[PDB]
Structure formats: C-alpha cells, structure tokens
Enzyme design. Structure first.
Site, PDB file in Angstrom:
ATOM      1  N   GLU G  51      -0.891   1.832  16.011  1.00 13.20           N
ATOM      2  CA  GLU G  51      -0.456   0.557  15.451  1.00 13.20           C
ATOM      3  C   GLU G  51       0.278  -0.283  16.489  1.00 13.20           C
ATOM      4  O   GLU G  51       0.233  -1.518  16.435  1.00 13.20           O
ATOM      5  CB  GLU G  51       0.403   0.839  14.213  1.00 13.20           C
ATOM      6  CG  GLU G  51       0.795  -0.340  13.324  1.00 13.20           C
ATOM      7  CD  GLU G  51       2.025  -1.077  13.817  1.00 13.20           C
ATOM      8  OE1 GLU G  51       2.877  -0.433  14.468  1.00 13.20           O
ATOM      9  OE2 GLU G  51       2.152  -2.289  13.551  1.00 13.20           O
ATOM     10  N   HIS G  52       0.961   0.367  17.430  1.00  9.28           N
ATOM     11  CA  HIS G  52       1.540  -0.370  18.553  1.00  9.28           C
ATOM     12  C   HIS G  52       0.471  -0.814  19.546  1.00  9.28           C
ATOM     13  O   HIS G  52       0.532  -1.932  20.072  1.00  9.28           O
ATOM     14  CB  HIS G  52       2.589   0.483  19.254  1.00  9.28           C
ATOM     15  CG  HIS G  52       3.854   0.605  18.477  1.00  9.28           C
ATOM     16  ND1 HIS G  52       3.899   1.187  17.231  1.00  9.28           N
ATOM     17  CD2 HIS G  52       5.116   0.203  18.752  1.00  9.28           C
ATOM     18  CE1 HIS G  52       5.135   1.139  16.772  1.00  9.28           C
ATOM     19  NE2 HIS G  52       5.893   0.554  17.680  1.00  9.28           N
TER      20      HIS G  52
END
Ligand SMILES: CCCCCCCCCCCCCCCCCC(=O)OC[C@H](COP(=O)([O-])OCC[N+](C)(C)C)OC(=O)CCCCCCCCCCCCCCCCC
Ligand SMILES: CCCCCCCCCCCCCCCCCC(=O)OC[C@H](COP(=O)(O)OCCN)OC(=O)CCCCCCCCCCCCCCCCC
Ligand SMILES: CCCCCCCCCCCCCCCCCC(=O)OC[C@H](COP(=O)(O)OCCN)OC(=O)CCCCCCCCCCCCCCCCC
Ligand SMILES: CCCCCCCCCCC[C@H](O)CC(=O)SCCNC(=O)CCNC(=O)[C@H](O)C(C)(C)COP(=O)(O)O
Lengths: 178, 125, 48, 87, 32, 76, 412, 68
Positions: G51-52
C-alpha cells in the site's frame, strides 16, 4: 497402478474424482438401475451447475462442502468390484503368481521337459542383458537437470533400444494364473 | 461433523490442509515426490539390473531395527514418568497377584485345616 | 449435554437458584437414606 | 468358466457401449478418436464413459490410470493389458 | 557395510544435527 | 469369434427407463446412458417377476400330483 | 428511491459495481479481499508495505510522473488497508472518468516495486510504527484484537511487527501481490456522476487480464477464527490518561442481527465513551472503548456493564425507538457524498456479495422491537467472556473475575 | 469346445432342457410334500388338543369353597 502418482492434486482431479466416488456410492443406496439412472443424472446436475465458477475461492468452497455432504451421505457397504483393492477377490490369485526368477533354479530334469519354453526364455534374458547398458545410460543421459523429479520413466527414443527399466512391467506374473 | 479420533482419523477429503494449499505447501509437496522419485529410481535400477545376485538391502529397514533394538539403551535417561512407570509395571502386578494367590492359598489352607473343603473324588493333584 | 442444562437451568441466576434449592430439597432425602444405609450396615446386629 | 477376452472382442464391446452414449455420435466414433478434443465430450463425461467400461468389463480402472483413458483405444489396450490378453 | 553414520543416533540437540539426521532417514529436513 | 447384438436394437421406450427418461425430462435433464442400461429391461429379462411367482413356482403340478396321490389312496 | 446500485461481472470475477448520481465528481475505487487475515506471519506487513509502494510508479508510468498525472486533472488519490479489505480509490471529475480507471488499472496490475523505494518506504513504515505507538486508542484496539484472537491470523496487526517490516523483499511482496490480487476477489466500484455502461466498457478495456487462477491450484482458503475471552493489561503509569476497550464476539457480516446490535449501540462517566461493532467474515468484536483518568476507571466499567445488562433485561420501547431513529440517521447521513457511497458499494460487494439498498435497511430496522433486542443482547452480551485491553494508568482497572462477574446479574 | 454353453451378450442366456425340468421338479416335489402332509397331518397350525378356557371351571371343580 501403472502410471505414476502426481505430486499435488489439481482442483479438477479432485472434483472429477468425486464424481466417481459419488456416483458409485449412489449405486449402493439406489440399487435398481432405473432409480439410479435417474437419481444420478440428477447428480451430474449438481456438478454441472457450479461448473463455470471462475472464483477459485468459491470453487474450493463448493468442493470442501461437497466432500463433507458426501462423507455424511455415503453408503457403509458400497459396491466395490470383485477384483479391486478392498474387494472380495483382491489378491486372491496371488498365491499362484510366482515371480518368474524362480524357474532359474529348476533341476535340469524339470527343465528338460517343457524345452521350447526355455529356448524362448533364454532369448528374452539375452534381450534384458543386451540393453541394460543403453538403458541406464538413457535413464541418465536424459535424467532431468537438478530439480523436480517424478517417477515417470522415459520411452525408448531410438530403434533397438527397449523402454528403460522394462524387465518387470513385461515379465510380470499373469494376473490370473488361474 | 466427522470427528477424527486417534483412530478413525480425518479422511484426506475433509482435511483442511488438502484444500487450502499455499505456494509454499505446493513446493513442499513437489519436493517430497522428488525424494521418493529419487529413492524410487535407485531401487528400480538395482532391482531391474541384470547380472545381479547380491541382496538388495533396503537400508531403511536396517535403520529401523537398529533404532528399535540396538539404539535404545544408548538413548536412555532415567527421568520421572519413566522410573515410577518403570516400577509400577514390573512390581505392580507381581505384588497384586501375590495378595491374590496368598489370600486364595490361605483361604484354601484354612478350610482344609478346619475340615470344610470337600476334596471329593479328587484322587489326583 | 450440560449445554442443554446450562442454557436452561444454570445460565439465568434465578434458575440457578431454583435448581440449587430444588436439588437440595431432594438431596437431603437421598443423602440421609444412602448415608443411613452405610452406617446401619456397618453396625448391623448392634442397633436397637 | 467364461471364455477369455480378445483384443478384438475387447474392442467391439468398448465401441459398442460408447455407441450407445447419446452424446457420442455413433458414426463418428472411431477407435483412434479422442473423447474430449475430437468427439466433443466434456471432462465429466470422461468419468462417465470410463465408468461404463468398468461396468461392461467388470473391473475398476484406477483413478490415476483413468484420468487418461482419452482415446477410445487406450481404453481397449489398457483393459486388455490389465487382463493379460496377448491376442 | 552401513556405517554408524547411516544408522540411528542420539536426540538431535542442535539444529544442524536435526538436519543431518533428516538426511540419514531420507526425509525432508522440515518433516523430521 | 463371438458376435454382438446390433447396438441399434436397444431402445428406451417400452421399459421402466422410459418413465425415468420422461421425468428427468420435465426437469429439463436427459440422461445419456440410458440406452446402455436398456438390455436389462429389453427382452427375455423384460417380464416383471412377482414374489408369489417364485414362492409358488411348481405349485401347479405339485397340487396336481397331490390330487393324483390322494386319488390312489382313495382307490385303495 | 436512490439510484439502485447496478452490479455486473466480468469473466475474471472482477465485480464492476456502480451507483450513478447527478454529482459531477466521482469516487472510483478498487476493493480487494486481501488483508492481514490472509497473511501467514512470514509476510505480516506485505499489504501495508505494498500500500505504500503502490503510488511510487508503475511499469508504464515510471515514478512521480504517475502522480503528476493525478495532479494534472486535480484528482485525489487515497488508499487504505484493514484486516480483511484493501482499497485504492480516486476522487475526480466525471469527464476524467476513463484515465482514472486506467490509472487504477496500473495500481492493481503492472505495478512496479522499486528496490530503491523499498528501502525508503521501509524507513517510512518503520519510523511511523516507531511513532505509531503514540496513538493510544490504536494501541488499545490492537491489544484487544491480539488478546481476543490469540493464535489466529486475526490477532496480527495490519502494519505487522517491525521485524517483518525490516525483513521484506520484492519477491515476497510480489507474491502477496500475485497471490491476493485475484480478479474474482476484486470489485471496481463507482459512485456519483458515472454511467454504468461506460464504466463497464472501461473495465473491459483495462483491468481484464487480472489474474484469476492461483500459482499451483494453491487456493488460499480461510478458517473461521476463534474469539478468546481474556484481559491484556499494558501498564505505563507516566501516561496522563487510560484507554480501556472491552468487547465480546460479534456475529459477522452476513448475520442480520448485526442490525439489532447496531440499535443496541445506538442506545448506549468516562471522558470519551464509544461503542463499536467491528465485523469480519463470520466473526467480530462488539463492545465499548473509553478513555479515562485512573481514579475513575473501575466506576466507568461498573457503569458500562450495568447498561449492557439493562439492555439484556429491561429494554423498553422508547429507547428502542430512539436507537432506531439514531441508526436511520447514521445510515443515511453516512451515505452522503461520492466517496462514502463508493466505499459502501465496495464493502457491500466484497462482504455481502450484493449492495443492500436503504429500503431493505429500513425494513430490517423497523422489524426490530424491544423483545428481540433484549433477546439478541442476552445472546451476545449476557454471561459471555470478554476481551479486555488496557493502556495507561490501569491499576484500578479491575481484573478478569470482577469484569466477568459484572457480565451478569444475580437478580437477572 | 471352448464353448460348452455359448456366452451371450446382452441377451437372455439360453437354457438347457434339463436346467428347467430339474428346477421345476425339485420345487414341485416341495409343494407335493407340503400339500400331502397338510392333508394327511393337519396339526401344524391347529394342534390336536383344544386349550381349555381356564375361566369356566365351576368353582366346585376347583375346590373353591364357599366362604366357609
Ligand atoms: C460454599 C460456596 C461459596 C461460593 C462463593 C462464591 O464464589 O459464589 C458462588 C457463585 C459465584 O458466581 P459464579 O460465577 O461462580 O456462579 C454464578 C452462576 N450464575 C452465573 C448462574 C449466577 O454465586 C452463586 O452461585 C449464587 C447462587 C445463589 C443461590 C441462591 C439460592 C440458594 C438456595 C439454597 C437452598
Ligand atoms: C508410587 C510409585 C513409587 C515408585 C517407587 C520406585 C520408583 C521411584 C522413582 C524415583 C524417581 C527418581 C528420579 O528423580 O528420576 C530418575 C532418577 C533421577 O533422574 P536424573 O536426575 O535425570 O538422573 C538419572 C541418571 N542420569 O534416576 C534414578 O534414580 C535411576 C534409578 C531409578 C530407581 C527407581 C526406579 C526403579 C525401577 C525398577 C524396575 C525393575 C523392573
Ligand atoms: C480375565 C477374567 C477375569 C475373571 C475374574 C473372575 C473372578 C471371580 C471372583 C474372584 C473374587 C471372589 C472370589 C471368591 C472365592 C475366592 C476367595 C479368595 O480367596 O480370593 C481372594 C482374592 C483377594 O484378592 P484382593 O481383592 O486383591 O485381596 C487383597 C487383600 N489385601 O480375591 C480376588 O482375587 C479378587 C479379584 C479377582 C480377579 C483378579 C483379577 C483377574 C483378572 C486379572 C487380569 C490381569 C490383571 C493384571 C493387573 C496388573 C495391575 C498392575
Ligand atoms: C453419495 C452422496 C453423494 C453426495 C456428493 C455431493 O453431494 C456432491 C454434490 O452433489 S455437489 C457438486 C458441486 N461441485 C463443485 O461445485 C465443484 C466445482 N468446481 C469448479 O467449478 C472448477 O472451478 C472447475 C471449473 C475446474 C470445474 O471444472 P470440471 O467440470 O471439474 O472439469
């Protein structure tokens, strides 16, 4: 019994091998042929639907609830064939399947009779020793690079050569020595 | 729900693992065939070998017998749960039956002494 | 199993008390009877 | 008691049964004709075919050896090989 | 003919020993 | 070589498979292997077997014989 | 009478859901059934770290040029991860509907994880976690999840332990990406000024070809977790305030009495008192979190437990009517704007498999009366073993026997 | 030769004269015997002794005295 066991089982072979146990365990509860040929085309329906589920997760959730439906709706004494493992004649005639390497210790008198028999047997034993070298070499030259190795053995791939390791699939005791 | 017991174990089907297989699991599964395939192609090339008279050994069976009758006392360490249980087994019943046979033999003897045991038509012993 | 019991007479405290009281009411009958059997038999031939 | 099989009597029965399966056309069934790529049947119908054969010849074609009875001929040599028919 | 190396030994104490035995017994080191 | 009856001979009508065929059909389904299971009901084995028939097999002559015997006794 | 949520299905299994409305801006998102529950303790931070990495460039749009595109139309790009779901959503205008969908396609597939970035995002994640401990209520809810779901994949946090964070590599990530990003477990949800046929054509154009089959028939099945009644107490007396969460086992997403339980929460001494009904796949946490001074804690607990037992024993029609009105206001006021409507569409297609309309919610609310509310509350609250998580000056927080005894009344 | 009784495929096995006659013979004798004995000796169901009604015995017969 002939072909080698695959390492892991696919989704399919697990589903398609229930279609066998299931339909075959439906012919114990439903003995008469008509009732069966009826109650079974209704079974396929169950498998026929949910055939095109693309959602694997779902598919493996229909399969896991199928095999529990089945385990609790199975017949205790199904119809297993007479000559298959678990059957009634399984390995019955094995008391007569001597392993063929025993005709080599027969007295020259015994082998005196039955003579053409041993004339052809000595040919085959010449075949076996005449290829062990080309065979093992084949088995090795074609051995897989390091990695997955299954029990499948190679075919011949050259004229005159005999399928590698063929002495005990051929020369195997006759099924029913009677 | 089927309930596997140490006996009547969980069938292949109905076993959670068989259904949810991770990539890791599959890899492991593939490897285990390799070990077996490897071992399979060693026996087969020693079994199907013309020109052989020596005894195929099956060393996996020789590692089993040695483990079971000649690798036991070299791996014995006297703990509790082993000596308490190693005395209840040797002297427990051996003391039980003594008070089973003494009490009977004593009951018999008393009765014979007092004159009650019939011992009729018993002319043998 | 106890489950059926629990959900019925052991989960609601009021019912918990009910089962206790009722059981105790009968327990005395049983205990006294059973106990007396034991004591009297131990001393049978000496009572009265 | 009964007479032993033949590599052409174990082939006429295998074609016979299949010619009685409605999906498999009885005029395009040829022994070298694959069940799933040439005749059209699905995967579930292979299980059903094999099972018919297991009941025509009275023995069980094991699962692993029967996930491959594709050609309508493999069935004819596999059955025979399992029953020792050297013709 | 089978050296003691290929016959059973003592409880594998360190992890290298637990992986050495698994070879002897023709097993996968994570299954021993 | 043993011949084999013409595959065509077998047909589902006229046998209990036909009624199974018609219902499965209401459901839209159709079983394809029926014809194979036809010779069961097709001929020779076509007649329904009733339980009295087996228990009473040969009763007809048995009683006939009973009569004859009683007769001889009557004739003295 | 809201425009109905129309759902279609591609071959792949990507459910394309949309809810048209007049607004000119839309919230188009992708919802994936992949969270920390699907991780196996060797990749406990894979979803968070992906997600980063998901906005740091793809193969077709390398690096910040990608986010330059989402600056160029003035759109907003957000992503979040829970224990069960992952969402990548864009708020944009209506006329920029195609390119946004194309952007989302890159984010789910064809994504590029740069090794350079991996170290930079590791320092970001590591540092944030190193400072995340600051947020107490997050610490307390993580402690509650851990002690309530001990030994299960539902105990482990979304972020994972620093250990895994440091020990993670592209290939691992690649796996999580290639394993838990399957097309049948994906919903393309759109809310606002969108046409369903245009969105379906855009999903057919991009976002077909999303994997639908596992590497080796390695289907990742899920086993219902186990709720565990227990009390975890983190004592640190230097903190000014104490946060305490007490929960019991919830029913799950598909069980309708959730609605009734929501009414019970709407019926319910500490500076902050919040009730929660967190739902996962056939499980959940139903309870209360309060943040208080040390010298009040026990009294709060006593207060709170009394209210629960009152809802198990003495529910009246007036408070039930008030809770029903509060729930109606909560649902309709939450479904406002394109972003929460798209969020509800994504969660509804992932959890229920369909979008439940507001009329069905109103019917399920109006069928709730006082008798079934106290029946369901006695089913879920009365004589149940709770999970307790405390953080701060929690010495006067009572231990497990006192809380467990407060979970029932001797007078019923 | 190899065929003493031609095997048959999907047809009713042909039957030999003797198979049918011997089978009807054994069964018919069973029925002749059951009928012959039933006629000559029908005391299989009935029994040749009639149960007395124990409740019709004049009390006098049973020595039942009349209340002293
Ligand atoms: C000697 C027993 C001492 C028990 C001390 C204790 O911890 O309380 C027991 C327990 C402690 O709670 P508990 O949790 O162990 O059990 C309670 C059971 N429920 C949940 C149903 C309430 O309290 C009671 O059992 C109260 C029982 C009241 C019974 C009143 C009627 C008695 C009739 C007698 C005739
Ligand atoms: C009720 C049951 C009563 C049973 C009485 C007899 C058993 C007594 C058990 C005592 C246990 C003492 C003990 O701590 O365990 C085993 C003992 C000490 O063990 P450890 O400290 O590990 O060192 C062992 C040597 N390396 O190691 C030893 O003491 C070794 C000698 C054990 C003697 C006791 C057991 C004798 C069993 C005789 C069996 C005969 C057949
Ligand atoms: C397998 C079939 C078994 C069938 C058993 C049949 C039993 C018949 C009835 C026997 C008991 C009543 C006998 C009445 C007439 C005989 C009276 C008499 O003299 O017997 C005395 C004997 C005393 O035994 P016990 O109770 O131990 O007294 C010890 C007192 N300190 O009295 C007794 O021995 C009572 C116990 C009798 C049975 C003993 C166990 C028999 C089976 C043993 C199997 C092996 C057990 C190994 C146990 C190992 C324990 C570590
Ligand atoms: C004796 C009692 C019998 C009771 C047995 C039990 O009821 C079984 C029943 O009826 S319930 C059958 C439902 N079984 C599925 O739902 C599996 C679906 N699996 C898929 O759809 C796959 O994804 C795939 C595409 C590969 C199928 O393709 P294929 O046809 O296997 O080749």
């Amino acid at each position: 019994a002939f072909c080698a066991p695959p390492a892991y089982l696919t989704h399919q072979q697990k589903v398609l091998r229930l279609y066998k146990r299931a339909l075959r365990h439906l012919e114990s509860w439903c003995i008469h042929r008509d009732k069966y040929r009826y109650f079974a085309c209704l079974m396929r329906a169950r498998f026929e639907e949910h055939k095109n589920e693309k959602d694997m997760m779902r598919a493996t959730q229909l399969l896991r609830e199928a095999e529990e439906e089945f385990w609790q709706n199975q017949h205790p004494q199904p119809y297993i064939f007479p000559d298959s493992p678990g059957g009634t004649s399984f390995e019955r005639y094995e008391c007569y399947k001597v392993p063929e390497w025993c005709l080599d210790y027969w007295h020259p008198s015994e082998k005196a009779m039955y003579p053409d028999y041993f004339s052809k047997r000595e040919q085959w034993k010449k075949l076996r020793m005449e290829s062990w070298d080309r065979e093992v070499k084949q088995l090795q030259e074609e051995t897989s690079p390091d990695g997955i190795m299954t029990e499948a053995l190679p075919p011949a791939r050259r004229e005159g050569d005999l399928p590698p390791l063929w002495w005990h699939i051929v020369t195997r005791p006759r099924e029913r020595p009677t | 729900k089927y309930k596997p017991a140490p006996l009547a174990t969980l069938p292949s089907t109905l076993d959670p693992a068989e259904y949810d297989v991770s990539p890791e699991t599959r890899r492991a599964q593939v490897e285990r065939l390799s070990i077996r395939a490897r071992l399979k192609r060693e026996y087969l090339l020693q079994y199907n070998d013309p020109k052989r008279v020596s005894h195929i050994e099956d060393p996996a069976l020789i590692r089993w017998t040695y483990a079971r009758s000649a690798n036991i006392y070299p791996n014995f360490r006297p703990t509790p749960k082993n000596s308490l249980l190693g005395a209840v087994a040797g002297f427990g019943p051996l003391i039980f039956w003594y008070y089973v046979f003494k009490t009977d033999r004593d009951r018999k003897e008393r009765l014979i002494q007092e004159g009650k045991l019939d011992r009729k038509f018993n002319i043998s012993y | 199993i106890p489950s059926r019991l629990y959900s019925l007479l052991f989960r609601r405290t009021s019912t918990f008390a009910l089962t206790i009281a009722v059981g105790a009411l009968f327990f005395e009958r049983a205990f006294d009877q059973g106990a007396d059997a034991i004591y009297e038999h131990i001393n049978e031939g000496k009572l009265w | 008691d009964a007479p032993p099989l033949t590599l052409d009597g174990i082939k006429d029965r295998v074609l016979y049964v299949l010619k009685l399966y409605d999906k498999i056309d009885p005029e395009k069934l040829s022994v070298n004709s694959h069940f799933m790529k040439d005749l059209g049947l699905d995967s579930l119908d292979q299980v059903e075919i094999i099972m018919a054969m297991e009941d025509e010849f009275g023995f069980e074609i094991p699962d692993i050896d029967a996930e491959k009875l594709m050609c309508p001929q493999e069935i004819v040599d596999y059955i025979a090989d399992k029953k020792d028919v050297y013709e | 003919h089978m050296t003691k190396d290929m016959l059973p030994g003592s409880y594998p104490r360190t992890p290298e020993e637990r992986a050495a035995a698994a070879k002897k017994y023709n097993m996968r080191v994570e299954d021993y | 070589k043993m011949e084999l009856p013409d595959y065509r001979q077998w047909k589902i009508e006229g046998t209990p498979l036909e009624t199974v065929q018609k219902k499965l059909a209401a459901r839209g389904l159709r079983d394809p292997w029926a014809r194979n299971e036809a010779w069961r009901y097709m001929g020779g084995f076509a007649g329904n077997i009733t339980f009295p028939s087996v228990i009473l097999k040969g009763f007809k002559w048995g009683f006939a014989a009973f009569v004859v015997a009683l007769g001889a006794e009557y004739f003295l | 009478s809201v425009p109905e949520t129309q759902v279609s299905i591609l071959d792949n299994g990507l459910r394309v859901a949309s809810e048209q409305s007049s607004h000119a801006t839309c919230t188009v998102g992708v919802w994936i059934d992949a969270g920390s529950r699907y991780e196996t303790e060797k990749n406990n931070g894979a979803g968070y770290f992906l997600e980063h990495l998901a906005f740091k460039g793809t193969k077709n749009r390398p690096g910040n040029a990608l986010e330059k595109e989402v600056e160029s139309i003035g759109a907003h790009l957000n992503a979040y991860s829970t224990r069960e779901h992952t969402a990548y959503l864009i708020k944009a205008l209506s006329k920029d509907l195609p390119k946004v969908v194309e952007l989302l396609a890159d984010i789910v597939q064809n994504s590029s994880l740069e090794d350079s970035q991996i170290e930079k995002e590791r320092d970001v994640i590591l540092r944030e976690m190193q400072e995340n401990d600051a947020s107490m209520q997050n610490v307390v809810f993580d402690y509650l999840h851990a002690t309530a779901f001990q030994g299960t994949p539902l105990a482990q946090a979304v972020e994972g332990p620093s250990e895994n964070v440091r020990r993670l590599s592209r290939t691992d990530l690649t796996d999580y990406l290639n394993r838990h990003y399957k097309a049948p477990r994906m919903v393309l949800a759109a809310a606002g000024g969108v046409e369903h046929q245009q969105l379906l054509d855009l999903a057919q154009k991009h976002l077909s070809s999303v994997s639908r089959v596992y590497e080796e028939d390695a289907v990742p099945g899920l086993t219902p977790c186990r709720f565990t009644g227990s009390e975890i107490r983190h004592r640190d007396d230097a903190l000014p305030l104490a946060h305490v969460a007490i929960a019991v086992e919830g029913p799950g997403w598909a069980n309708p009495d959730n609605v009734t339980l929501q009414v019970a929460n709407a019926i319910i001494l500490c500076q902050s008192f919040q009730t929660f009904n967190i739902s996962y796949s056939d499980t959940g946490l139903l309870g209360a979190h309060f943040v208080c001074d040390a010298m009040s804690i026990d009294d709060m607990v006593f207060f709170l437990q009394g209210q629960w037992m009152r809802l198990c024993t003495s529910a009246t029609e007036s408070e039930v009517t008030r809770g029903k009105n509060i729930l109606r206001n909560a649902l309709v006021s939450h479904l406002d704007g394109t972003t929460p409507v798209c969020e509800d569409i994504g969660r509804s297609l992932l959890t229920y498999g369909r979008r439940i309309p507001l009329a069905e919610w109103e019917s399920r609310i109006q069928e709730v009366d006082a008798q079934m509310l106290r029946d369901i509350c006695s089913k879920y609250f009365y004589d149940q073993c709770p999970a307790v998580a405390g953080y701060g000056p929690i010495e006067q927080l009572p231990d497990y026997n006192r809380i467990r005894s407060g979970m029932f009344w001797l007078r019923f | 030769g190899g065929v003493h009784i031609q095997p048959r495929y999907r047809e009713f096995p042909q039957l030999t004269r003797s198979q049918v006659i011997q089978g009807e013979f054994l069964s018919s004798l069973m029925w002749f015997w059951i009928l012959w004995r039933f006629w000559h000796d029908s005391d299989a169901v009935l029994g040749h002794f009639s149960y007395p009604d124990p409740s019709q015995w004049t009390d006098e017969e049973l020595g039942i005295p009349p209340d002293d």
